[PDB]
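Hi P.,

Sorry for the delay on this. The queue was packed all week, but I finally got your sequence through. Input first:
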Amino acid sequence: NGNMINLTTDKAVYQAGEAVHLNLTLNNTTSLAQNITATAEVYSLENKLKTLQYTKYLLPNESYTTQKGEFVIPANSLANNRGYLLKVNISDSQNNILEQGNRAIAVEDDWRTFPRYAAIGGSQKDNNSVLTKNLPDYYRELEQMKNMNINSYFFYDVYKSATNPFPNVPKFDQSWNWWSHSQVETDAVKALVNRVHQTGAVAMLYNMILAQNANETAVLPDTEYIYNYETGGYGQNGQVMTYSIDDKPLQYYYNPLSKSWQNYISNAMAQAMKNGGFDGWQGDTIGDNRVLSHNQKDSRDIAHSFMLSDVYAEFLNKMKEKLPQYYLTLNDVNGENISKLANSKQDVIYNELWPFGTSALGNRPQESYGDLKARVDQVRQATGKSLIVGAYMEEPKFDDNRIPLNGAARDVLASATYQTDAVLLTTAAIAAAGGYHMSLAALANPNDGGGVGVLETAYYPTQSLKVSKELNRKNYHYQQFITAYENLLRDKVENDSAEPQTFTANGRQLSQDALGINGDQVWTYAKKGNDFRTIQLLNLMGITSDWKNEDGYENNKTPDEQTNLLVTYPLTGVSMAEADRIAKQVYLTSPDDWLQSSMISLATQVKTNENGDPVLYIQVPRLTLWDMIYILE
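Then the structure:
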């Protein structure tokens, strides 16, 4: 159900002083030689800023792709740090619409305000190696990501070792990879970094912050190691903190407060980033632990100990000072520690979230779409930033007899696809709340069917399910939406205590739990920005609210399609004249197939409550998975 317009831009992202060069393809799919017209309307939210247009006389079945200069949005035409929509209609000489497609355009200083982050990793077909022979596949994936406006790339497992992350050699072995013995060809990584940069995006190098590999000579004296306070998973009290598998040490850890380690790892990362052309550091840690310095390793006094997480903010501030031209972030697994970390000098906030983490809502697991929203909100409240969420989908898991341990593993045995709507709902839940779901991946992997991958597990190169063509196309639609409406979703936009409600035409209230922890509802809530309100409608009709879909297709995640819904929104404190004005300026947009980020005007009536306060009664024509109502106010 995709179009053949092949709408493409020269870059993924633009500075305000940079022209947008667009190319589009006009197809005469008719039996008559005639003028075919491409009309590309440039919208800023509901406002049509420009109409672009070009017509070409084409013989039957003839196509023409526009050349450089033919469709252009000149420099200094668009306000900075904003998203726009290009709404394209191809028409014949009778004004019949032959095909339609929409594309967002992102104008921004850099990726920090509205991060749209994808991963890049080695190829499962080639022992998870990163190889020059796979560049053509990577470049096809990267072209698709460019046209999805991705502004940043997480280079996963491209490093040699934690203390020598990207040396100047042609190839290296990743010796810590004991399961497949992956290799890296450095020219391949450099070519991927150069290609990312051609699009305007940045390249982030993933590496641990405190680690060294256990089978390499220590890069510093034991005075700089960190020690366990209590006997546990990382070894005995008074011994170096060690990550082991099957009684074999894999990594030892340094004290974040060690100045020698701070200087060592910052300088090592600077050299590695300069070797590869990287733009910053995607940090990680093995997990939190109560620890002692070397000087205190023999103490049993808890007041002499500290949690690693209580020194991460200081360590990151030191890294930022030592890496001033580089971007920096640190995964905070399950978002446990935003309160501790809120003042740290990270450029973006990144959390890998798991359903077994404790929810930001309180004492429940982080397993539902509403728990993802709550974490996003918690980060915005603490830092003012939009949370990048790693929330890997389905994660099929097996035992040794390949017995499935979950329903997604049953799908794997059936050579099935990812459950498209499950992935889209998680992406929707996170973006509607003001975050970004880091889900898309360039992995040169055959199960991605020529498109882009979807992250399924912590080891990003693994793709056990197929990405259907439908999911590839709908992922593209959703990325255009998250770009085009970024200013409505995450630019000084906060929760609204006004409680919208959603009804069918025949007397049912479909909004039942505004926290989004129960399914079988139209999850409905509002947000407030500077001159507007939004109402998010996430369709959970007839489906559960768990975001991960570990069941795969054993638990259907296509919600029951709705039509002709009514949404109410109270305007208490607003005059009738202002309400009437607002009612003529209610719009809806959706990334689902019926609109593909197009915006429509909604019929709306102003009624009053018992006290004469205005209430909007908004007619919503359709809800597939995700609608956003935009109320100018």
